[PDB]
Design a protein around this ligand. Structure first.
Ligand SMILES: Nc1ncnc2c1ncn2[C@@H]1O[C@H](COP(=O)(O)OP(=O)(O)NP(=O)(O)O)[C@@H](O)[C@H]1O
Ligand SMILES: [K+]
Ligand SMILES: [Mg+2]
Length: 785
């Protein structure tokens, strides 16, 4: 009818891309969300819908609208780097045919093309907030046409979610300062979306946006809870008396039986488990039982139509900086796998693709995946309502059970929450539970608050708020004031700590050098005080014989990245060379405190002055980072310190970004000598390499491992690599592969095996990759001239 996608004036290049797989007609709620109101005119919109209902199409049609009609640039903001990268490639594939340049601002990644020569920028929260501030410093704010926010419910409380408010308030503040222009239409449109929030109307009013809400969902979700053999619904009514056709020993809350039942019916199952260790243990059991039950009585997958793709998955894992996991090597041949934060992001990209293609039918995951990328399944099983020793959060629950039901595939989506008689009441609480109202995170015996101090600093230093009148005008645009002193307290704080200047033109506020430095560094004003002192302390007495002391200055300690074994730490302390003990003493690492940690598990940290704990945690971390840029194997670092490869990769990408911040901060203060030393560690922390490999790693396909083996074989630079014979590069790459046996038959059937993974990847052969490396090296060599 009228909701036919071809009747919406869709460009042919995009219309076919939509018709490429499904997407011929729209939903009832999608048509009402666009037409009703002035949404297509330029009015802001805040809409909510259940997961897997088609929230993406609404935004896509609006973005494609403004970009092509108004010829302005769009901003897409996503919570995590993984979902941001996924969204980039998904939007690129649709719009590359219409000459629409789409790049991304994610974590440490930087766009090759300037923002001025783009159309759609995909960002995380941190990078988006920074880009906005960049446009303010350059006054090129007129470029921005609209901002799209995914998961608008992260506005309440998160590690970086509060920045979403400061970002939006900043947009609402600038457009209000332009409302006093008295002219004589569209400006900057804000499209926000989330899950069903109780105070969603409050959010739409704050942004002066039209509201929309629906409960529509193409596949019905059957939320249930299992106690023993019986399965009940949300009203405690029995919906199924489960009886295992076959039975095995073990814990067995019919967990294997439920999964086996699902696979036999040609479906797939997601199994959520509390700890990282349970996922691997359970994935091993299920795969083992799947072998016994099928034949009625760590190898290769059976010869089927999917044998090649199963082998490619196992081979791609092997040729990764992580190698092929021992448990995965056993389970994956039988469509079983696990998924947690312990794996590297590259391993998880493989498994999700495997599960999405049907190669993996059973996936035992953690709560990390529930908030990650889009990955649906027929049945979702939650092993227990007790996660991490604490009862499961309501938001986590709705994110898990929301992945039950594949649109266009399954008739229903089933959700089972396994409980006992004791925790029976807590399970029902989750099924009937609903999301809590979104807090402002700028709430006030705390007249001053971090989020506010940062918010006030950004508008003054940026030069969009000078007087005292501008400050309270900004206070009106906040989400905190939307629900209907503290502002004045934050301004004085910025004055007391040399962040801002006051010139009595009565009462006008200007940025200091320390102010302008903090803004350019994307640093929090609360953290900047200790960082500024730490740097001044380091410049009074600095160790240069090793790279440890420099690394300490760029070692992040705002969050715990692992659980440190203190006994292990003290063992490394004694074996620690004298040159590195000097750095420890010079920082604050006292041997006495290390002894009181191993002897007694007293965390203390109740006193604020107990940043003494953070110091030892920070020095422990710098040691890990030291070995990391010394090209020490991940397995050695794992055994030496007691942390998995997942925690390490999350740390280095965090330290790579942080290292860049401290470098900028030092540059804006005129500290050249300090800047000079730090400016080489951002690149080394990223790839985990030494100075020699810095030139090789410019090539996209070359990481730490591939760069070293090519260096040790005669290829030291890109220039040397452009002259390279392709088949020689291929051979050197083949030598870098990790095998359990001391490897490094003739199989000429593996000449087409795609065993090398990339980002936004087609499977690459070891030959094709080598030719790409030499081809890219030549293109770079020419751009170097
Ligand atoms: N208008 C539509 N027409 C046909 N199929 C659609 C439409 N919208 C979504 N889909 C299907 O849903 C799939 C993707 O899931 P989607 O509906 O986009 O979930 P979402 O709500 O946008 N994301 P999220 O809830 O955050 O996980 C698409 O690939 C389609 O198969
Ligand atoms: K690279
Ligand atoms: Mg969405």
């Amino acid at each position: 009818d009228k909701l036919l996608l071809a009747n919406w004036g869709l460009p042919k290049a995009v219309l076919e891309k939509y018709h490429s797989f499904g997407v011929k007609k729209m939903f009832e709620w999608q048509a009402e969300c666009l037409l009703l109101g002035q949404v297509l005119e330029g009015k802001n919109l805040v809409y909510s819908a259940p997961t897997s209902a088609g929230k993406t199409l609404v935004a896509e049609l609006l973005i494609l609208k403004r970009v092509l009609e108004m010829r302005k640039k769009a901003l897409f903001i996503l919570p995590f780097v993984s979902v941001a990268k996924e969204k980039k490639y998904y939007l690129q594939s649709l719009f590359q045919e219409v000459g629409i340049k789409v790049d991304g601002y994610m974590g440490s990644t930087s766009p090759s093309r300037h923002f001025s020569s783009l159309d759609i920028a995909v960002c995380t929260i941190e990078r988006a907030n920074g880009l906005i501030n960049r446009l303010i410093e350059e006054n090129k704010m007129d470029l921005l046409g609209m901002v799209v926010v995914d998961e608008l419910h992260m506005l309440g409380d998160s590690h970086r979610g509060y920045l979403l408010e400061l970002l939006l308030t900043k947009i609402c503040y600038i457009t209000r300062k332009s409302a006093s222009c008295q002219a004589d239409s569209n400006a900057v449109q804000i499209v926000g979306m989330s899950a069903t929030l109780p105070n969603l109307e409050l959010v739409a009013s704050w942004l002066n946006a039209e509201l929309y809400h629906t409960d529509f969902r193409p596949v019905p979700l059957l939320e249930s809870v299992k106690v023993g053999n019986s399965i009940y619904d949300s009203s405690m009514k029995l919906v199924r008396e489960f009886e295992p056709m076959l039975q095995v020993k073990g814990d067995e809350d019919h967990v294997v039986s439920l999964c086996y039942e699902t696979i036999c019916d040609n479906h797939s199952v997601l199994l959520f488990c509390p700890s990282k260790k349970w996922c691997e243990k359970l994935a091993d059991i299920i795969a083992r039982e799947f072998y016994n039950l099928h034949h009625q009585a760590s190898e290769c997958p059976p010869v089927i139509l999917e044998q090649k793709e199963l082998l490619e998955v196992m081979d791609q894992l092997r040729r990764l900086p992580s190698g092929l996991d021992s448990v995965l090597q056993k389970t994956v041949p039988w469509g079983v796998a696990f998924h947690h934060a312990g794996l590297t992001f590259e391993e998880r990209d493989i498994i999700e693709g495997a599960f999405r293609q049907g190669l993996i039918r059973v996936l035992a995951a953690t709560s990390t995946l529930s908030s990650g990328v889009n990955l649906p399944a027929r049945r979702v099983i939650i092993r227990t309502p007790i996660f991490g020793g604490r009862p499961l959060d309501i938001l986590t629950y709705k994110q898990m059970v929301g992945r039950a039901g594949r649109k266009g595939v399954d008739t229903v989506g089933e959700s089972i929450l396994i409980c006992k008689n004791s925790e029976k009441s807590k399970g029902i609480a989750l099924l009937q539970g609903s999301l809590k109202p979104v807090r402002s995170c700028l709430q006030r015996g705390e007249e001053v608050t971090g989020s506010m101090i940062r918010a006030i600093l950004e508008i003054i230093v940026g030069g969009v708020a000078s007087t005292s009148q501008d400050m309270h005008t900004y206070a009106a645009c906040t989400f905190l004031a939307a629900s209907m002193g503290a502002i004045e307290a934050c301004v004085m704080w910025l004055l007391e700590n040399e962040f801002i200047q006051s010139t009595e033109e009565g009462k006008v506020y200007h940025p200091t050098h320390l102010g302008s430095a903090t803004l350019s560094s994307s640093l929090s004003p609360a953290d900047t005080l200790d960082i500024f002192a730490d740097l001044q302390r380091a410049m009074k007495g600095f160790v240069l014989e090793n790279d440890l002391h420099i690394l300490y200055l760029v070692t992040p300690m705002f969050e715990d990245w692992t659980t440190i074994d203190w006994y292990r730490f003290f063992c490394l302390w004694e074996k620690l060379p004298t040159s590195m003990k000097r750095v420890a003493e010079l920082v604050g690492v006292e041997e006495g405190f290390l002894a009181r940690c191993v002897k007694g598990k007293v965390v203390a940290r109740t006193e604020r002055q107990h940043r003494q704990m953070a110091i030892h945690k920070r020095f422990f971390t710098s040691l890990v980072l030291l070995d990391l840029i010394s090209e020490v194997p991940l397995r050695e670092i794992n055994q030496k310190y007691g942390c998995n490869r997942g925690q390490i990769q999350s740390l280095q990408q965090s330290a790579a970004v942080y290292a860049g911040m401290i470098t900028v901060f030092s540059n804006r203060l005129g500290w050249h000598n300090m800047e000079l030393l730090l400016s080489q560690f951002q690149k080394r922390l990223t790839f985990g390499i030494q100075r020699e490999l810095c030139d090789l790693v410019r090539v996209s396909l070359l990481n730490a491992q591939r760069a070293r083996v090519l260096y040790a074989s005669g290829f030291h630079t890109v220039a040397d690599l452009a002259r390279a014979n392709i088949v020689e590069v291929e051979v050197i790459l083949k030598n870098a592969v990790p095998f359990k046996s001391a490897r490094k038959e003739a199989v000429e059937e593996r000449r087409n095996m795609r065993t090398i993974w990339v980002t936004g990847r087609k499977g690459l052969t070891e030959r094709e990759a080598a030719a790409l490396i030499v081809e890219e090296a030549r293109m770079i060599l020419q751009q170097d001239l």
